[PDB]
Design a protein around this ligand. Structure first.
Ligand SMILES: *[C@@H]1O[C@H](CO)[C@@H](O)[C@H](O)[C@H]1NC(C)=O
Ligand SMILES: [Cl-]
Lengths: 124, 131
């Protein structure tokens, strides 16, 4: 991997500290290299590596990962099976943040407009 | 008419339940405490205003949501099928409470708007059945 990027299973990763909202973070990742985007996390092993990497780069270890809108394409249904049409669900776009604690790692969601540090990834 | 203390609206009967239960337990309660009962389904703005008035008493309590019968029934913890990069979402690691696949009325809008929240969380709710 290039200077500043760390290697893990044929991919290159890099954590960026300066906070940004999800979309600008994604753009910034795409600019750094071909095939680079906010990191998708496919297993606990990949997750562990990215977490240790973040701990070295971030004082406040929270970072955007590649999951924008976990509630995209949901299929809302009424328990009485009435047809779903009228709706008052108006949640704005939310994005995923990976948090690294001393005893564990977990993900939670925040408005995509919030500013968070982030991590990029691309196939070598 | 409606039985006991249930309130009528557009040919249905409704009842606000103060004892908190998770979404599944609330739905079951509604099925057990009323003939063909279920957590409330809200199919129009008018019905929503009626339900909001029905639960106006919960504005003083600490609970910020009231269960309604809407949810995504899948086994998965979220809906989006893919990561930003196109790969499939399979492995996920949500903190407790961060998988939100059931819906409830929101206290901030005086119980008019709905929000998806943790199905296992405990909240008061509303039952509905056809008269
Ligand atoms: C992220 O920042 C850019 C530029 O500042 C802005 O255009 C975009 O709308 C922001 N995204 C959100 C969700 O606010
Ligand atoms: Cl159901």
């Amino acid at each position: 991997c290039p200077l500043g990027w760390s290697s893990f299973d044929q991919h290159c990763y890099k954590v960026f500290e300066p906070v940004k909202n999800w979309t600008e973070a994604e753009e910034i990742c795409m600019q750094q290299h071909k095939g680079s985007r906010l990191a998708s996390i496919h297993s606990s092993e990949e997750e562990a590596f990215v977490s240790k990497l973040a701990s070295k780069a971030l004082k406040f270890t929270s970072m955007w990962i590649g999951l924008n809108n976990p509630w995209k394409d949901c299929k809302w249904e009424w328990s009485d099976n009435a047809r779903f049409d009228y709706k008052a669900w108006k949640r704005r776009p939310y994005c995923t943040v990976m948090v690294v604690k001393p005893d564990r790692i977990f993900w939670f969601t925040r408005g995509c407009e919030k500013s968070v540090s982030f991590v990029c990834k691309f196939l070598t | 008419d409606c039985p006991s203390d249930w309130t009528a609206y557009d040919q249905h009967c409704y009842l606000a339940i103060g004892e908190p239960q998770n979404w599944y337990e609330a739905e079951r309660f509604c099925t057990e405490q009323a003939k063909d009962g279920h957590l409330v389904s809200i199919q129009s703005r008018e019905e929503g205003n009626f339900v909001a008035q029905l639960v106006s008493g919960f504005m003083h309590r600490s609970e910020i949501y009231v269960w309604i019968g809407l949810r995504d029934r899948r086994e998965e913890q979220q809906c989006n099928p893919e990561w930003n990069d196109g790969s499939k979402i399979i492995y996920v690691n949500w903190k407790e409470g961060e998988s939100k696949m059931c819906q409830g009325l929101t206290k901030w809008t005086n119980f008019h708007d709905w929000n998806n929240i943790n199905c296992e969380d405990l909240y008061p709710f509303v039952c509905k059945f056809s008269a």
